[PDB]
From a paper:
Citropin 1.3 is an antimicrobial peptide secreted by the amphibian Litoria citropa (Southern bell frog). In this study, the structural and functional properties of its non‐amidated form, which self‐assembles into distinct fibrillar architectures, are investigated. Using cryogenic electron microscopy, X‐ray crystallography, and fluorescence microscopy with model membranes and cells, diverse supramolecular structures, including canonical amyloid fibrils, multilayered nanotubes, and a novel mixed fibril type, are identified. Citropin 1.3 with free, charged termini, has a net positive charge of +1 at neutral pH, primarily consists of hydrophobic residues (9 out of 16 residues) and adopts an amphipathic α‐helical structure in its monomeric form.
Citropin 1.3 was found to form cubic microcrystals, which diffracted to a resolution of 1.6 Å. The crystal structure revealed two chains of the 16‐residue peptide within the asymmetric unit. These peptide chains adopt α‐helical conformations, tightly packed through hydrophobic interactions involving residues such as Ile5, Val9, Val12, and Leu16. Additionally, a hydrogen bond is formed between Lys8 on chain B and Ser11 on chain A. Each chain also exhibits an internal electrostatic interaction between Lys8 and Asp4. The α‐helical dimers further assemble into a spiraling supramolecular structure. Inter‐dimer interactions include tight packing between Phe3 and Lys7 of neighboring chain Bs, alongside interactions with Leu16 from chain A. Furthermore, Ala10 and Ile13 from chains A and B of adjacent dimers engage in hydrophobic packing, as do Leu2 and Ile5 from neighboring A chains. These tightly packed helices collectively form a supramolecular assembly resembling a nanotube. The fibril's surface features alternating hydrophobic and positively charged zigzagged belts. Nonetheless, the structure confirms that citropin 1.3 can adopt α‐helical conformations in addition to the β‐strand‐rich structures observed in cryo‐EM studies.
Residue numbers in the entry:
A (entry chain B), B (entry chain A): 1 to 16
């Protein structure tokens, strides 16, 4: 779902 | 870590 996409993007940003 | 970030970015692209 879109929300699973946003959650993954959030994790990526958290890992920068 | 890095590898998780790479997989998450890949998953997002794949899912868009």
């Amino acid at each position: 779902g879109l929300f699973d996409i946003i959650k993954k993007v959030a994790s990526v940003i958290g890992g920068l």
